Amino acid sequence: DVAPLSLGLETAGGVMTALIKRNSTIPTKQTQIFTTYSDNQPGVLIQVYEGERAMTKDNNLLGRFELSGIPPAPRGVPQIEVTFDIDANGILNVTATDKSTGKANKITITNDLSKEEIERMVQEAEKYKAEDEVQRERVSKNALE
Numbered sequence: 828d829v830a831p832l833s834l835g836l837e838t839a840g841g842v843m844t845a846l847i848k849r850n851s852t853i854p855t856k857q858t859q860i861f862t863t864y865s866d867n868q869p870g871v872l873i874q875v876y877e878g879e880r881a882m883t884k885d886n887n888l889l890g891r892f893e894l895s896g897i898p899p900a901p902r903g904v905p906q907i908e909v910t911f912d913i914d915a916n917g918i919l920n921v922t923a924t925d926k927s928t929g930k931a932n933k934i935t936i937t938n939d940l941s942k943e944e945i946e947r948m949v950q951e952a953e954k955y956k957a958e959d960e961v962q963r964e965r966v967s968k969n970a971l972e
């Protein structure tokens with residue numbers, strides 16, 4: 828019925844950027860436009876995370892993929908459309924497409940975590956809320972490494 832945890836990707840500096848917020852009613856689909864962190868960046872690394880903490884290392888890793896072929900351009904210029912789609916079949920599709928060329932890549936994640944363990948991740952997130960927000964402020968926008 829609901830996404831029991833926030834679902835997102837890692838932005839510059841190991842920052843958790845949520846696309847599907849905790850308690851979102853399923854089916855659900857969200858999209859954010861992302862960019863490159865450094866000049867002439869040839870591609871982006873999509874790292875799929877679950878959890879509430881501000882830094883991805885403290886959340887759970889679900890999968891990875893790279894979208895390469897990004898032409899040389901300055902930082903913050905390329906447009907990378909990243910969509911998270913949760914279906915009613917227990918299939919999570921994460922797609923990243925380069926808006927300039929149409930070049931894309933994707934990962935499929937299925938549901939095959941305990942209720943208490945889910946309850947702990949949200950407990951831990953509000954306990955570490957301040958420390959997490961400090962690291963976020965210090966290290967962060969919509970930039971992808």
Ligand SMILES: *[C@@H]1CC[C@]2(C)[C@H]3CC=C(C=C)[C@H](C)[C@@H]3C[C@@H](O)[C@@]2(O)[C@@]1(C)C(=O)O
Binds near residue numbers: 830919
């Ligand atoms: C944490 C790990 C991932 C997942 C099993 C999700 C993976 C695939 C999905 C497909 C529609 C769902 C978005 C799943 C929702 C949820 O059960 C899940 O996010 C967690 C909390 C889990 O229970 O293992």
